[PDB]
Amino acid sequence: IELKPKVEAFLNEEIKMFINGEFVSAIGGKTFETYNPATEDVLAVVCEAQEEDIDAAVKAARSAFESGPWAEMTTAERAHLIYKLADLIEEHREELAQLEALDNGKPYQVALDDDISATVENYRYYAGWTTKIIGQTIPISKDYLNYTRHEPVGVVGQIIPWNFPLVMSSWKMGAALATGCTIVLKPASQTPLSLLYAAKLFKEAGFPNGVVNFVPGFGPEAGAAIVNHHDIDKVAFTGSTVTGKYIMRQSAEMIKHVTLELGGKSPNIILEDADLEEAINGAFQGIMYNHGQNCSAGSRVFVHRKHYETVVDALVKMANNVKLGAGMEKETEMGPLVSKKQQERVLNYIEQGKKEGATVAAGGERALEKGYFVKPTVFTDVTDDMTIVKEEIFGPVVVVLPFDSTEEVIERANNSSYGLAAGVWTQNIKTGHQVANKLKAGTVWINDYNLENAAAPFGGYKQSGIGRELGSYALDNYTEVKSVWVNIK
Amino acid sequence: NIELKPKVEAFLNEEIKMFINGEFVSAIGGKTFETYNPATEDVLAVVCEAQEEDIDAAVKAARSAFESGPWAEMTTAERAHLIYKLADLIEEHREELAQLEALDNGKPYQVALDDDISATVENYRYYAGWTTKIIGQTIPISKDYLNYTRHEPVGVVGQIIPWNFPLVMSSWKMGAALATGCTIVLKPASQTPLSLLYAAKLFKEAGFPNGVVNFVPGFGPEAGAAIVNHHDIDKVAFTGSTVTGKYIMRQSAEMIKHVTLELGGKSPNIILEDADLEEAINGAFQGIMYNHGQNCSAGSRVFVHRKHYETVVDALVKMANNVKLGAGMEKETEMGPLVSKKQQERVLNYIEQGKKEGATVAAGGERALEKGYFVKPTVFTDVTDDMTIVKEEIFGPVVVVLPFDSTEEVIERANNSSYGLAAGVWTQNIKTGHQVANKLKAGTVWINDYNLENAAAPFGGYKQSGIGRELGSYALDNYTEVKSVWVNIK
Amino acid sequence: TNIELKPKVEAFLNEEIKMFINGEFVSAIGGKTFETYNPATEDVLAVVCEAQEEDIDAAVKAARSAFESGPWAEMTTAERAHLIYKLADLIEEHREELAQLEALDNGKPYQVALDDDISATVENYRYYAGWTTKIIGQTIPISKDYLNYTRHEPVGVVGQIIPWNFPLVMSSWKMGAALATGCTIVLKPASQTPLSLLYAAKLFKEAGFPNGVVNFVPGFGPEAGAAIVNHHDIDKVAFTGSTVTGKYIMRQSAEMIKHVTLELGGKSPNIILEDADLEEAINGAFQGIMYNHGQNCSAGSRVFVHRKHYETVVDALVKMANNVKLGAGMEKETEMGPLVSKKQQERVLNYIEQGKKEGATVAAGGERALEKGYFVKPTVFTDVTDDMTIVKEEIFGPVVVVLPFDSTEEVIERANNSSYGLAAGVWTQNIKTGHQVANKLKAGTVWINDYNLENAAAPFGGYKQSGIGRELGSYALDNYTEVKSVWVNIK
Amino acid sequence: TNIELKPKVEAFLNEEIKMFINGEFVSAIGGKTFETYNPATEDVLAVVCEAQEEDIDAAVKAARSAFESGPWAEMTTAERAHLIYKLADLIEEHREELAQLEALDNGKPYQVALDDDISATVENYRYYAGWTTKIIGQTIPISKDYLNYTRHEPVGVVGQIIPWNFPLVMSSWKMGAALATGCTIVLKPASQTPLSLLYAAKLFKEAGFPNGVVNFVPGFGPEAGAAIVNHHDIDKVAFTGSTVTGKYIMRQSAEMIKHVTLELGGKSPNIILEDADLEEAINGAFQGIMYNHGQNCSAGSRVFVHRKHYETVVDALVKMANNVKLGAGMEKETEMGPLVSKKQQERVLNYIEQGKKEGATVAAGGERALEKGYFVKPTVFTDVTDDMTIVKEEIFGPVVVVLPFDSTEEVIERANNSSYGLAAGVWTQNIKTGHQVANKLKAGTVWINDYNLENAAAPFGGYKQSGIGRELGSYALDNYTEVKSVWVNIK
Ligand code: NA
Ligand code: NA
Ligand code: NA
Ligand code: NA
Ligand code: NA
Ligand code: NA
Ligand code: NA
Ligand code: NA
């Protein structure tokens, strides 16, 4: 797939940060390389945000929050900006899909059909909420007017991971912007480009200077500078547990509100009365979608004893059938993992799996001559206490586990520190809702898997997170509630 | 002297048991501590002291009660009725409970009765009403799915409360939690265990299932920490000091555990040029002096437009000097002692720090009476924004009075603070009142009033005064996990 | 085995039954009275004061006063809630007395009145007590230059009229929501069944309701009912009953641009698909129509059965129908009482005769029962077609039609081919089928694998000609408020 | 100086104006046409196809089919949203064309049409686009045995009738809410002002609305109007306009138990208290009435003035009245245009004559203006009492009565002593007085230190005989929704 002219021009120059409505270099001039994970080549050279750059972005966001058009605009004017931003992203859909394929590694056609569509729709959806963020009037006494206001919290720092780089930026920014906050946001070092391209479109849509500030760089410097900044009012992070925990401990010092979206080890449960054809397809897609680089991937596939060997046989064939290649080549179904480090991590987990006694029924090694490719992998002969069953692998790797009763699968499914999502396959109306009610996860799909939409909340129970993104629910993260009492005698 | 109620005598005449799994019990290791009467300094009761092991027993009971048996299976109508029967019982025991508050915490009995017990009753009545009404969403996305959310109780919640409004504080924790269907492990402050441990009898009589509520009296370092660090508690909520608030957020990180915190303040109470001055003088005085200043949302910075500053200082000084200090169980008392010797010493050292930095004690500024933990109502003037006493929460009957010259100036100076719990604004102008309310960074703003709370209105801090809200519908969301269910109907 | 009369019921019934206006038990101004009957025995059960247009006037003036000034107008929402809760506690204390009154006056079995009606009544008040403090409006972010807020103000004096089939429960569907908003109430019970409401007036008084907040005016539809409908100073009307009256009500309400809520009748389908759990569906189909003697607006009076199970379900329905124990509501043996009046017995027996002459076959029942009182046998009609009178029209008795079908598309179309739309049942074990069918039925309530469930928290009301508006739930509140949008210029 | 006509406007007016049915521009089946006029010149402005009963039937069938099957029924909520936002974008792109059509057909000044009416229409659609994905029902925690959820389903085919005073804006107040719920529409504009709607139909098509989702049927009350009101296959009706028609519509809707929303007239009070900012309140009182030539249901047609200020306010209003520049809407200097028709001018002049006959003083104006066109001078009446016709009745012209008062209790009582209750204004600097007075005024919208402000997000509608129900805001959606309560047995 030949590069669009605007992608070629963008990549032909150093990639600048976006602060206070301007494209700028890091103050101290540092740069870093992002790669193409299919070729291992340097894809661009990007300006590297340091602490002093974050502090500049924070002042920019503070000023835009406190005075100027953003602080003065009506809600309808604010909605219109977000709507225009969505339209612009849709206009640049092929450019942005190419950058995602190039920079992240995923198939261009998927980045275009799924990731760009979702980002557009998320911004459309949240433009909608700007004029509808309502407080209460509260009837207490004839002597007072009691009302609440849902005020924006102020300057928000946001950090996102590399698996759905553009989409993830929209999960953070659509709700935050809709409330009237301003933003200092950091993309992942592996994937800065789609966001920094999208910056052009915030400027074009007419966002006032400093409303949005994009600071690409590395967790331990740019990331930690966001986490530790005294003038950031609220933090939101999606990423590592270790980083999640760190963020929470640091935010303690300022009594700062945190939203976290972390990992999972989500179960996808095939009951005796499932439509087995459709469940097999849901189980396969459930783990293999986005190369398994998906926090809510259905990495534990629980299968009723009667169907266990049927599903294993089908999963093995489908895994071997997947077409691996560069995301910018048209026949590719599954691209490489994002980095050498991730490839080595996923291959390490496969070795640990075999070491602990499990059997690789398909895959279980690297693929192709170069690039960070891993073959789709199916593990079988697996038990609940194995490392590969307990821990999030974050690649195209599924464990398949038989079970004999519904009480049992619920227990086993819930016996996890994680609780991001779950799938249940059954044609029975009672069993579907009953099993859904008892699973400890933020999202349950009945007879489907991996569905997300702007309108429906997503987040973790237990150690898969604190709080919800998407829906009306996301808005509450970026608001402070003021209770006003007017003595009316 | 107010004579002790028969049921109060009876209660005080034996060891005060903790309440676990529906039973009154001693600590497993038999440890006990003393609570005191702060007006007299005498030992008031001997109370069973919860240790780590007793928190574990409580958590096990709450877990069991949550996962199966009547509390798990009950309809929301049946749950609501339990909570309303509890409120009715507390109301029947109102005199006994108000006496225990006056005795244990130190506040005037008639205020405990008219304010504290009344609010607790109303907070439970209000929350009983929410059980049947904690609704999720059905979400129109596509003709191919039913999309709905469930607001599920989060599970066992651990709650820690302070000593300044002991019983009311217990109700701000438990009303919302219980309405959601959570089960509870709650620790009263070691200075004020008694009203809660008495009210325990009422939960049992109301018909609460074993283990749905569990009260574990003791100390921050042991009972407190055991709640904070317990792996099987799903969610924590705390009201109290900042150091503990930070500690609790820090520790909750290890479990990715949701935290709600209600912390202290340095709340401004602002008298503008067109205030009704007589009303605003009364509201400025009551704003700080109510509950002996032991009030996180106390109006401890009184900002007074230059035209009225001398007039207001003069009045506050006279009012301060006239307040009648005495024991909470003496009928003539207007203000009781502080809760402890340590608090009295804390406040008095703040006062000394204020004099050391150049402020003037216009009234008060010393201990009171021959015994008990009393501090005189104190008014400081000649104060500047950089002074320790104007920055930090004193938590006694100590007010600073600051003049100002412009609205824009006072809004800046009111907001120049790490705290953001509450604020008051006094002006007769409809545009000024709302404009100033809007610009203040405070979780509650009163226009032409101060210190009003009601179960239906949320309360809590911006900035370092807290995370989250209590009261209102808003409190409920702390105790809920949201589950998004997608049903393929293609 | 006769259920023994509560002493309090015997005392109530030993005197003329007064109406309740402005806090006091009073006679009609003109002293007219009427008779209510015991439909099991046909005896006079009580003599009741008959409200005339002038008694409505006095009730309306009393409600107006209580709304505009005095304790009901001044009370906090907490205070108002507490009255409503205390009323619910009093009803629960008098549960036996009230259930006997239902059984005597209405006819239904005592145990059913106690377990169902009285408990629903109590729960309805407790649920709406809970709303008083939670009737919130909005603050609306538009511009920095304005504060924009709404108030959900009580409409004022509300006129309510209720039917005889669930006398006390129906009073609480009207008053719980109206009282929660802070309205004041002029309410007329059915001439057939005045007594449980008038007994309950004691408990409003004991609970501490201010004078005039509630006013109960027993009498007939053409005098007392019409008076409430036509009264210039009633702000809003709510009615449950006959369509012809519902139409009249809507027509008269035009003249004053008055908001109307209507809950009307139905011809609700109860649909057994091929993959139904036949055990529970057959029980659901039988209780769906026979509950309350078929005197139930949302009765499942059309039972559609997939061709595969048609014979099975017809045979089982006929057996159950023939096994029902008919008798007095105050005899412990009774499973089904009489119909409420001679007029209604005659109406239902007319429909049955009409069903016979249009060609349908009575597979069970189809006639009067026992030696006295207004009893009709449980009746099952087979060999029916969709254009029959008995399949189209509401019968309001223990009369079911059974219709086979061959495809899901077909049953949805036939179920929906009705001017009514109150309720529907769908029996299928399939998770996709249950929701899809539920989505496509035009009915205010759809039960999936059940039938006849109501709860204070879940709204109820008609599509099409089964009504306007909803009762129960948070939804009922909105009928009793006017929304006021306030703009405060803040520069 | 004349505003020069846009090319697209000339083009549109150079042919017969077709109606819009099932996605196509068509003539009336029987070929009837009617004339609309330019009320500044009294010239024929356009010839418009006239919908008859038969054309209404065709629009209803198209809407029915669009509702039951096809893209509109199948589309996601995101897809439906996007159609609505794109419509808003198109309207904005054609803002000058649409503003000219409004100036020409309705009368109002071009620049006000542009800045106010067109901006409000655009923002209305953008607001409602945003609701499509957010129309949520409830999950309701009752028992562990059931999942209880509600669906807010679109009612179906909706019949809407709008007046001539804000033609395009009024069209958006009906369709934004309705289309956001998934309903389909048969909408009739006023015969006096059909053009802007029928121009806008081109933009519904260009946005990509499926065939029959919207259908525009211009014509006359007694034929087109009545056919919408009386149609058996319209599910719900909404109307804005006269009282006599409002009452007709409610009466006719009884026959089908059809939900009705009415936005009717007012005689709204604009109260200037002793502590008002007097300069701002005089400007608010003058604009409250004279905006849109007084052709405004919520016009502040009763200016109450505290006695201290009475003379001052009278003198100011008189000066301001006599200073308004009357002229054609398409003339750049015009501050106020003519009334919409000869009949309206005659009505307003008949009112003014009644006021004189009853003893009131024409302080300014009170007669027609200019050499042709339906102009009336801005008119100020003094020496007025509460019982006069001109004080009680809605005149719908640029005519104000000015009433002195002496106490706040007095002005509230006199303000509320009306069958109308659409809107009110209160002018006071005092924070307690403002909210207190606002709490007591029986009106759907209360402005404190302002007047005539509307926004898509803030509900609007009448207390008493000013209406039933609310338009705008979240509240408007409920009128277009049937609530279904689903119970899923999960035992
Ligand atoms: Na990369
Ligand atoms: Na968590
Ligand atoms: Na103590
Ligand atoms: Na905070
Ligand atoms: Na009777
Ligand atoms: Na209807
Ligand atoms: Na015209
Ligand atoms: Na009305």
Can you walk me through this structure?
It is classed as oxidoreductase. The entry lists the keywords Rossmann, Aldehyde Dehydrogenase, oxidoreductase. The assembly is tetrameric. The entry is titled "Structure of Aldehyde Dehydrogenase from Bacillus cereus, E194S mutant". Four copies of one chain form a homotetramer. The first copy, chain A, is of the alpha/beta class and 489 residues long. Helices cover 39% and strands 20% of the residues of chain A. The first copy, chain A, is built from 16 helices and 20 strands. Chain A has helices spanning 5-11, 51-66, 69-72, 75-91, 93-104, 108-129, 165-179, 193-205, 219-227, 241-251, 276-288, 308-321, 340-355, 387-390, 406-414, 429-438; strands spanning 17-19, 22-24, 31-35, 42-47, 135-137, 144-152, 155-159, 182-186, 212-214, 234-238, 257-261, 267-270, 300-304, 359-362, 377-380, 397-403, 421-425, 443-446, 465-466, 479-487. A seven-stranded mixed β-sheet of chain A has the order 14-15-16-13-12-17-18, with helices on both faces. Chains C and D meet through strand 6, helix 10, helix 16, strand 18 and strand 19 of C and strand 6, helix 10, helix 16, strand 18 and strand 19 of D. The structure holds sodium ion (8 copies). The site of one sodium ion has 6 residues of chain C, from strand 3. Residues 34-35, 43, 103, 190-191 of chain A line the site of one sodium ion (NA).
Labels describing this entry:
homotetramer, about 500 residues, alpha/beta, Aldehyde Dehydrogenase, Chain A, domain 1, 7-stranded mixed sheet, 6-stranded mixed sheet, about 40% helix, globular, binds sodium ion, oxidoreductase, Rossmann, Aldehyde Dehydrogenase, E194S
